[PDB]
Design a protein around this ligand. Structure first.
Ligand SMILES: [Mg+2]
Ligand SMILES: [Zn+2]
Ligand SMILES: [Zn+2]
Ligand SMILES: [Zn+2]
Lengths: 347, 27, 220, 320, 60, 60, 103, 84
């Protein structure tokens, strides 16, 4: 179709097939099998890489297990490495690294899989390429006897920042709770201290949620197992690269909560079979809306929302029921349910 | 054949909708 | 043995409980099973001592009628089955057989099932709870659902125009009463020519009118 | 199953009666008679209802233990000689018992120094037998993860009768199974997360040490131990990273797909990524506009690791 | 003639005559064979009607 | 089995014996085909069943 | 048999040997008596596999058997291949009554 | 009479092979004992369903959870846990 921006011709000494690797101006990478004796072009491969036109380069003998393989890195809006393993063609991205051009690199120090390159920021840098996603290892798994007293309970994400993630663990014996906060890809320190976590005492979280009642602050709501609902305030320091947690108040609830989410501006909990919508007040949480559910809904274990209008409610034994928000009525109205008994975990 | 309104003095937590709408008329 | 009102207080749907449910060996187990969500009741001709489908309604059963897509093959004209040849002529047709008694187009036969009607479905398919009972008339019901869809307020068909003595271009004879009483309550948004819609729209069979995202993984 | 050494295969079950009014657990022995081609129930004992684990030991007459009440197992008739023993696990103690009913040797499980009052009682969950050259030792494991060593001894003082001893061995993670290899390796199949390959550094407590050893001679003595934070009898050779149980997850990135989780046992953040991994060793500043790069082996110093690197700018070219 | 052979009291004869309607229909087509089979469904006898019902599913 | 059995539950403990013979003959076919698969669909609640397994109500 | 209601199957735990059909019964499912699409071979129990009877057909019980018996596809979809030994033990009144009227 | 005699004879063989068949005079005590014993087998038997129950009970090992589900088939097990 479009004008070629780069092209490279490679023979794999393993198979003996000739491959023609072509990059285009619209960010599309193509690959060709060249017939040897005649020269016919077979087995057409195509993948859209990015916005920039595709630049190619070639890496002679890189190791897969960390058997020889050759790979062609593909340069565009992002980088892609394009290899063949066990006669399966693979094209995957590279871990957080834009490259303008790329070449192999060998020392006594860096014996295998070394690579030197010019980054898009403009710096020249030496590296290793390590874990190629084959079909038996699609994911690269990054991290005396090593046993913790704390058990992980829930992982949360901030509403406005997609990159920040909050972690909550429970102590196995002492009714404590620790909280970690990893912004972007690194953990933050607690206040001005040395540690990377804050331990809350006399709390174990059944469920939790991070909710922005207003658009400039973020709040952690914990549901404790003692029928309490606790509000904290998350204060990330940004330059000291630290967070803080800070109690606001404690609110009493009738029943345990297993599902809670942000519904437009408030906190939407399910306690037992009751759907309760809460607003932030400065002495306690304030319940703005209370809806009772149909009779066969016994516990709610899961809910989800579609653009602050519809509500999908999941019962422990029955199934899904769908509700619509009545703004004038200030309640949720049920309008569909299911024919069989489904024991919902997540919806 | 128990909702809440926040009294501006903040201690209105233990009240009601219907109590707060009466105090719209007293206020 | 519990009484009937005693048993009705234990359940959320006391209209499901009847008098013979108190003769159960376990009325409390029986009554809670019946009021479980999505449990369908026992077919109701258990009480009767006649015979399932032995009533008078079966006298009026019509012959089978082909789905309308299959009528396009034209088999009904070539073999007539609704109401000949002597025994000598049948005997003579075995030693001298006639060929091509059916003139069916083979490309039309295949394309009925696979091209024209790959997405064909019958108009009535009983839903989850709809259990069949003896005097049920499914023919009336598909006629009634089709009667609701095509037929609309704001048009009157030619068949009724012959009966009413109301030809086209003409205000229907309750026009004056809706000038005296008013517009229909059940149609807030009905615009009628001559009351709240222009009189030059009073045109043919129409005099009035109601004037008030793709799914995940949809096929391209 | 019992190791019967080509005689008649035998096996032992723990069984409860599904219809009976009171909870009662039976210990049952079954012998396949190959001469008659059928399974016979040999023995049937009532045991304490907290029975939850059974393990078969080796033929004890090989190790000079006298398995009959007779002081010498020299009667040499076939019925008297075959008498297998098994280990039964209970709440807070163990038994070794006889097929022929002669013995019932009770030893209590050693109890930990700081016990959490939430979970009351200790039970056996897995075990393994390894034959030594003139001896054997049985590795038992509790639901707290403590590894215990059991030994059965000839008891020269009394009548040459069997004698059972337990000691603390090490503490590992709770396991479904244990396998010992002939090279002296131990494989533990964990119930949660990572798998482990160990090796035997020491063989544990010697039988003479009276202070650290419970015996079946006095079957009511208790022994408090403290678990060791470091492994004294074993060392780790390998782990296998397992994500089981994964209870909660978020998606960090969409291009390429990366997910964040926690490791349930050691409480670390785990990130699974569909990218090819890059490790930045060193980075250096460069003049501003650069486009392309070449690496060509240095022809000057032959048989040497020297290399030429060419960087090109739109006006200029650099050689290095 | 195979149609007259279906009245046989032998089960091999009826079973292999029904196989033969398949081979004849693969050569000369379904619809000459369908008409003779459909008209054979009007007899009183059950053996004849059950063997022509087998043969129609073979032709199909 | 879960959607089919919605037609069957009501007749298992009906007052009439003829209702109850016909419905247990269907239950027994279903049970031979699905002993393990019927388990999520039994109409048993804690009010209905004295010995109801409390492990079914646990949330992880 | 699907047709004669006085015939009695064994239904014991199946063994390792295979049940045979005669030339008159060849190609039939033992359960539903269907002539088409065979899926899995038939295994008979130990007692049905001993002696002079083991050579006989497992459907009609008198003639000598030559080929193997198969469950059809639809009996394997229903699980009826796992119920037990599908061998008929008695002869049945249809067989018996012809034998004594004739001589 | 012979078609009715088969279905009587086959009801006994299927009731011995598979425990939980019934007919028309099954007590609720008999029926509910069947439903409980089938459900406890499933919770014990599928290994995801073992881990779900063992974690949320907060048990000390997964094998302690398997013996709790298998002893619960016994009618005298509620009284055993109550006599501790
Ligand atoms: Mg409810
Ligand atoms: Zn048999
Ligand atoms: Zn035969
Ligand atoms: Zn079959």
């Amino acid at each position: 179709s479009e004008k070629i921006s780069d092209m490279i011709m490679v023979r794999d000494s393993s198979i003996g097939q000739l491959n023609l690797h072509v990059g285009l101006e619209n960010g599309v990478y193509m690959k060709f099998h060249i017939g040897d004796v005649d020269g016919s072009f077979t087995d057409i491969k195509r993948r859209f890489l990015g916005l920039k036109p595709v630049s190619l380069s070639y890496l002679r003998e890189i190791s897969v297990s960390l058997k020889w393989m050759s790979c062609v890195v593909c340069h565009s809006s992002s980088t892609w490495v394009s290899y063949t393993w066990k006669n399966v063609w693979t094209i995957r991205q590279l871990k957080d690294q834009n490259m303008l051009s790329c070449s192999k690199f060998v020392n006594a120090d860096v014996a295998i899989n070394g690579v030197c390159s010019i980054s898009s920021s403009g710096r020249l840098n030496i590296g290793r390429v390590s874990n190629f996603p084959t079909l038996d290892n699609w994911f690269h798994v990054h991290e005396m006897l090593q046993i913790s007293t704390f058990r992980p309970r829930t992982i949360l994400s901030f509403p406005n920042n997609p990159k920040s993630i909050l972690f909550i663990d429970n102590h196995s014996g002492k009714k404590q709770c620790r909280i970690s906060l990893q912004i972007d890809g690194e953990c933050l320190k607690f206040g001005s201290s040395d540690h990377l976590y804050k331990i809350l005492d006399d709390i174990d979280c059944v469920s939790a949620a991070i909710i922005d009642f207003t658009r400039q602050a973020d709040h952690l709501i914990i549901c404790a197992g003692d029928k309490r609902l606790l509000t904290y305030k998350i204060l990330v320091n940004k330059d000291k690269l630290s967070f803080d947690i800070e109690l606001l108040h404690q609110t009493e609830i009738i029943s345990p909560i297993h599902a809670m989410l942000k519904f437009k501006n408030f906190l939407l909990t399910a306690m037992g079979s009751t759907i309760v919508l809460y607003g932030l007040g400065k002495k306690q949480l304030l319940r703005r809306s209370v809806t009772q559910t149909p009779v066969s809904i016994t516990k709610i274990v899961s809910m989800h929302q579609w653009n602050y209008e519809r509500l999908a409610v999941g019962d422990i034994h029955e199934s899904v029921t769908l509700f619509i928000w009545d703004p004038a009525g200030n309640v949720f109205i049920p309008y569909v349910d299911d024919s069989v008994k489904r024991h919902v975990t997540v919806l | 054949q128990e909702l809440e309104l926040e009294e501006e003095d903040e201690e209105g937590n233990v009240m009601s909708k219907k109590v707060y709408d009466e105090l719209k008329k007293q206020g | 043995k519990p009484s009937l009102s005693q048993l009705k207080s234990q359940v959320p749907y006391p209209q499901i409980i009847e008098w013979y449910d108190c003769d159960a060996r376990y009325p409390g187990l029986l009554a809670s099973i019946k009021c479980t969500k999505n449990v369908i009741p026992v077919p109701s001709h258990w009480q009767s001592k006649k015979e399932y489908l032995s009533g008078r309604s079966l006298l009026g059963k019509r012959p089978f009628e082909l789905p309308d897509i299959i009528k396009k093959t034209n088999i009904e004209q070539m073999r007539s089955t609704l109401p000949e040849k002597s025994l000598k002529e049948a005997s003579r047709a075995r030693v001298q057989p006639k060929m091509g008694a059916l003139d069916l187009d083979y490309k039309k036969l295949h394309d009925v099932f696979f091209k024209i009607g790959a997405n064909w479905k019958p108009d009535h398919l009983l839903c989850f709870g709809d259990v069949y009972y003896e005097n049920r008339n499914l023919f009336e019901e598909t006629n009634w659902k089709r009667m609701v869809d095509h037929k609309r307020p704001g048009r009157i068909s030619q068949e009724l125009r012959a009966i009413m003595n109301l030809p086209e271009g003409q205000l229907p004879p309750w026009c004056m009463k809706m000038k005296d009483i008013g517009l229909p309550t059940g149609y807030p948004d009905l615009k009628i020519a001559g009351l709240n819609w222009d009189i030059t729209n009073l045109k043919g069979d129409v005099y009035g009118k109601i004037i008030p995202r793709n799914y995940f993984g949809a096929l391209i | 199953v019992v190791d019967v050494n080509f005689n008649n295969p035998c096996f032992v079950t723990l069984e409860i009666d599904n219809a009976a009014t009171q909870l009662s657990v039976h210990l049952i022995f079954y012998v396949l008679e190959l001469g008659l081609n059928h399974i016979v129930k040999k023995a049937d004992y009532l045991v304490n209802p907290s029975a939850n684990f059974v393990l078969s030991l080796p033929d004890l007459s090989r190790y000079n233990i006298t398995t009959s009440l007779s002081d010498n197992n020299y009667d040499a008739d076939y019925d008297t000689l075959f008498n297998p023993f098994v280990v039964i696990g209970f709440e807070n103690h163990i038994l070794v018992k006889d097929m022929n009913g002669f013995f019932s040797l009770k030893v209590e499980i050693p109890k930990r120094s700081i016990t959490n009052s939430r979970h009351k009682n200790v039970t056996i969950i897995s075990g393994i037998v390894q034959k030594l050259k003139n001896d054997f030792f049985v590795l038992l494991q509790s639901n707290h993860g403590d590894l215990f060593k059991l030994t059965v001894s000839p008891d020269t003082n009394d009548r040459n009768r069997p004698l059972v001893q337990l000691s603390y061995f090490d503490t590992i993670q709770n396991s479904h199974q244990l396998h010992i290899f002939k090279n002296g390796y131990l494989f533990a199949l964990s119930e949660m997360n990572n798998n482990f390959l160990f090796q035997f550094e020491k063989l544990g407590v010697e039988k003479n040490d009276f202070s650290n050893v419970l015996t079946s001679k006095d079957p009511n003595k208790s022994l408090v131990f403290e678990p060791s934070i470091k492994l004294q009898n074993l060392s780790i050779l390998s782990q296998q990273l397992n994500l089981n149980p994964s209870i909660k997850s978020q998606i960090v990135s969409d291009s390429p797909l990366s997910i964040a989780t926690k490791h349930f046992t050691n409480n670390k953040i785990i990130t699974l990524t569909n990218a090819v991994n890059y490790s930045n060793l060193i980075s250096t500043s460069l003049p501003p506009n650069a486009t392309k790069l070449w690496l060509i082996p240095d022809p000057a110093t032959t048989g040497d690791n020297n290399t030429l690197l060419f960087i090109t700018f739109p006006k200029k070219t650099m050689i290095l | 003639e195979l149609l007259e052979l279906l009245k046989s009291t032998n089960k091999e004869i009826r079973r292999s005559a029904n196989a033969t309607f398949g081979f004849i229909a693969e050569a000369i087509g379904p619809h000459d064979v369908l008409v003779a089979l459909l008209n054979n469904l009007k007899v009183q006898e059950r053996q004849l009607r059950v063997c022509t019902a087998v043969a129609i599913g073979i032709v199909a | 089995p879960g959607l089919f059995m919605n037609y069957i539950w009501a007749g298992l403990f009906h007052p009439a014996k003829n209702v109850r013979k016909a419905f247990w003959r269907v239950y027994n076919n279903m049970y031979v085909m699905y002993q393990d698969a019927m388990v999520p669909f039994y109409p048993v609640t804690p009010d209905n069943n004295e010995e109801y397994i409390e492990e079914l109500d646990l949330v992880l | 048999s699907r047709h004669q209601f006085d015939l009695i199957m064994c239904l014991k735990q199946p063994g390792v040997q295979t049940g045979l059909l005669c030339e008159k019964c060849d190609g039939k499912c033992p359960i539903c008596d269907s002539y088409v699409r065979p899926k899995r071979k038939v295994r008979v129990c130990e007692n049905c596999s001993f002696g002079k009877q083991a050579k006989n057909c497992i459907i009609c019980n008198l003639n000598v058997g030559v080929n193997d018996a198969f469950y059809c596809w639809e009996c394997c979809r229903l699980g009826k291949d796992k119920d037990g030994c599908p061998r008929i033990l008695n002869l049945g009144s249809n067989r018996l009554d012809r034998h004594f009227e004739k001589k | 009479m012979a078609e009715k005699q088969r279905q009587l004879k086959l009801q006994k063989i299927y009731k011995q092979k598979y425990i939980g068949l019934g007919d028309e005079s099954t007590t609720r005590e008999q029926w509910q004992r069947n439903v409980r014993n089938d459900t406890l087998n499933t919770l014990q038997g599928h290994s995801a369903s073992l881990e779900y129950v063992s974690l949320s009970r907060g048990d000390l090992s997964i094998r302690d959870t398997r013996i709790h589900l298998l002893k619960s088939m016994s009618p005298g097990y509620k009284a055993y846990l109550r006599e501790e």
